[PDB]
């Protein structure tokens, strides 16, 4: 249950709070506050919804907030307490939510994906020409370093769109790797190439996450701290 503390930084780990699971817990209904967010959905998503929730509301009560529902707002972002920020991620074998608290954090993004080849079209959708020539240079051969920087763009967005309210496209943002000496973590800075105008506080210029891989996974995390 501790596979994204590997993308969490120690500088504000007191006011973050994370939890995950790797498949769908049975006999989880829906709160029925939450139900019509997946009424018309299938049922992998209806299970895979309810698991991310349980998640959100584990991590949420580590951190002293009481257990409640979480709706969901402009563009599918999760409606958080008073107080919390925090994003939300599933993929096959992985659910999982990290939260804090907006005195010390400004906005969590996370993202989890296999670790897997994605298919050449569409990596020059989701790329930059300097990013694909870059990322081979900074990354050992090994990984799926069009999968790692797929994974870093989605918790680029995450971590933004609560600040902006606006899209973020995959040409919006230019996305910079660094690898640990032990060549299965590291960081990136995510550089927005638009406008990066707020709701409050100053404006998004530059996110820094970290990534990693193991058990088959990519995860990523961006948490911008309060100032
Ligand atoms: C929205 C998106 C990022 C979600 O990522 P995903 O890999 O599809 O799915 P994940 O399971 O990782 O994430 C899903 C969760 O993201 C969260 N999310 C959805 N829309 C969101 C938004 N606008 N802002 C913040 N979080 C959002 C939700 O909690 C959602 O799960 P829920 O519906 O169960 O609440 C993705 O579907 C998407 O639309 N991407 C396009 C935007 C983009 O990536 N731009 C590139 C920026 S450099």
């Given at each position: 249950?501790?596979?994204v503390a590997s993308v969490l930084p120690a500088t504000v780990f007191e006011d973050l709070a994370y939890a995950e699971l790797y498949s769908?817990?049975?006999g989880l209904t829906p709160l029925p506050?939450?139900?019509?967010?997946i009424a018309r959905?299938?049922?992998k998503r209806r299970n895979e919804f309810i698991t991310v929730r349980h998640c959100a509301r584990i991590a949420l009560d580590q951190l002293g907030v009481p257990p409640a529902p979480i709706?969901?707002?402009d563009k599918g972002e999760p409606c958080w307490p008073d107080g919390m920020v925090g994003s939300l991620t599933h993929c096959a074998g992985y659910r999982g939510a990290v939260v804090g608290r907006r005195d010390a954090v400004?906005?969590?993004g996370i993202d989890a994906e296999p670790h897997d080849v994605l298919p050449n079209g569409v990596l020059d959708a989701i790329s930059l020409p300097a990013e694909r020539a870059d990322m081979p240079r900074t990354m050992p051969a090994a990984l799926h370093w069009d999968r790692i920087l797929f994974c870093a763009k989605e918790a680029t967005y995450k971590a933004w769109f609560p600040?902006?309210?606006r899209w973020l496209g995959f040409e919006d943002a230019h996305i910079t790797f660094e690898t640990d000496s032990t060549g299965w973590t590291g960081r990136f800075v995510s550089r927005i190439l638009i406008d990066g105008s707020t709701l409050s506080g100053p404006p998004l210029?530059?996110?820094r996450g970290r990534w990693s891989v193991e058990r088959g996974l990519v995860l990523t995390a961006i948490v911008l701290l309060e100032h």
């Open positions: 249950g501790t596979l769908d817990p049975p506050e939450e139900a019509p967010l959905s299938v049922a709706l969901k707002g400004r906005s969590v600040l902006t309210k210029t530059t996110l």
